Amino acid sequence: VLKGVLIECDPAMKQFLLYLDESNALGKKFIIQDIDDTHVFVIAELVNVLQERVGELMDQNAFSLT
Amino acid sequence: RNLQEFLGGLSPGVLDRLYGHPATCLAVFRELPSLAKNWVMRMLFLEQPLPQAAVALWVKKEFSKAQEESTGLLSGLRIWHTQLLPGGLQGLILNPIFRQNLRIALLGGGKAWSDDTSQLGPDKHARDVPSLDKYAEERWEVVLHFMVGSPSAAVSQDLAQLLSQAGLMKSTEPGEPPCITSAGFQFLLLDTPAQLWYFMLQYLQTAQSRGMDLVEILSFLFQLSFSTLGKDYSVEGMSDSLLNFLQHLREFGLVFQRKRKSRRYYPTRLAINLSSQPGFIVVETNYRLYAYTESELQIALIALFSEMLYRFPNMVVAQVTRESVQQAIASGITAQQIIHFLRTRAHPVMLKQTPVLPPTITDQIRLWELERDRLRFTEGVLYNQFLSQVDFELLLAHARELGVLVFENSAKRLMVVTPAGHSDVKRFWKRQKHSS
């Protein structure tokens, strides 16, 4: 059995996380278990960098008016 | 919470004692729905109970849901009580005390709510309505600044303790000033009548600590609610505790009084609005806010969820950006509260349009709110070691019975449960194999 964090979101973000896992963007393969098309299993020790990457992807194609 | 929710949990004796004051009965009647008011008026001049079916036939079949809701609310408020009509029938009759007080309030009779005002003659230091409004605004601004933590605003110790008990601000260490939490921000974003009502409800809840009569405080508050603006009332005729409570109202700006020993007190506009102005914010389709305000309180409130651009001596020009909204949400303020605050403070010019605010801006704010909650994270334990479907089904049923299940998938025989229930699930699984 595994101990960690289940992450649920739209399939686009799941595919983005899979691309990050295969490209070693975070430096390792910590995206370990895939259970569903919209659910993934991730070790909680580095969830913060995943949030940072998601935020960077989100605000990259945003064109903030500030 | 609202008045009806607070009154629902009170004992029947407290509700009956509340109905002893005509002012309370009028407030309760006005808090009733539209359908309930007609029923109360029809049954006002009835000395005999009416059959339940006869009352139910007044409203059409299509609107029976509203009739049922009104009847349930009236029963919960104990305005009327079912009477055992002879022959096995059930009769509906209003509470005699409540009905008598309502008739006294409407038709007349008995003594006046206030003792007298002409016994002491005109007030030597009487003020005017604009002065009272300015005093109330200054008091409210001081209170809200003290909530923010500005050193310019200083209040009494018990008032600060009340905020701590309300959960708006927490005092981590003694001596150090408390820090405003997310609940404090939500309270700040609320409308002024809503803020006053919430503060009064918190005061009523905490009054049990001081051992003060809830009925007397509620009756006095309701009497102040219907009090005419600009007219003084006699301090005499009240218990010692209530006057002390009145002194707290003096700190809240609801009631203005020259001195503690003075026998005259003037209810303010805020006290009248407690029972229930034009708005000073103009919203443009280009995500720009134009506010006609000068006090630092409103400027800070707007800057909480917006980026400031210009501050003219009588104008504030700000821009609503994605980053500002995200920061405000991270501070704990939801998009619905922001929309409600903008609608409440909306300029009268914008009221001409069929929508108070443009749909595009509200939709954009709501979409920005959902950005933070787009990703769902659940810490837990995943079981994926099921050899047979039957074994998986039993463990899944046990987890559902325990209520610790997070996610289930019978197609792949994978489950995810909370870490707290992981020990219980493991113990159950071990017992099943060992006993087999």
Instruction: Give the experimental resolution in Å.
Output: 3.9
To the nearest whole Å, the CA of A66 is away from the closest chain B CA by 7
Q: Which residues from B are below 8 Å from A5, CB to CB?
A: 377-380
Give the separation between CA B160 and CA B218, rounded to whole angstroms. Answer: 22
- Angstrom distance (rounded) from CA B206 to CA B196: 15
CB contact under 8 A, A6 and B385: no
Separation in Å, CA of A16 to nearest CA in chain B: 13
Nearest to A66 among B307, B371, B383 (CB): B307
Partner-chain contact A64 B321, CB within 8 Å: yes
Residue-by-residue DSSP string for A17-52: HHHHHHHTTTSS----EE-SSSEEEE-GGGHHHHHH
Domain boundaries, chain A: 1-66
Q: What is the spatial order of strands in the sheet that B264-267 belongs to? A: B233-234, B264-267, B255-256
CA-based max dimension of chain B: 94
Q: Report CB contact under 8 Å: B375, A36.
A: no
The tokens of B245 are what?
């409570």
- Own/partner long-range contacts of B403-406 (Cβ < 8 Å, ≥24 apart): B406/A6, B406/B378, B406/B380
Provide, as residue numbers in chain B, all residues whose Cβ is less than 8 Å from the Cβ of A66.
307, 319, 321, 323
Number of other CB atoms surrounding residue B216 within 10 Å: 17
Residues 6+ positions from B427 with CB-CB distance below 8 Å: none
Which of A3, A6, A20 to mutate to test binding with chain B, by most B CBs within 10 Å of its CB? A6
Taking the CA of residue A26 and the nearest CA in chain B, the distance in Å comes to 18
Q: How far apart are CA B177 and CA B155, in angstroms?
A: 12
Cα–Cα distance list, B49 to B95, B315, B331 (Å):
11, 61, 55
- CB-nearest to A58 from B307, B371, B377 is B371
Adjacent-strand bridge partners of B308: B318
CB contact at 8 A, B223 and B111: no
Nearest to A7 among B307, B375, B383 (CB): B375
- Interface contact B322-A2, CB threshold 8 A: no
Report phi then psi at B123, rounded to 5. Answer: -70, 135
Q: Select the residue of B287, B378, B419 nearest A6 (Cβ to Cβ).
A: B378
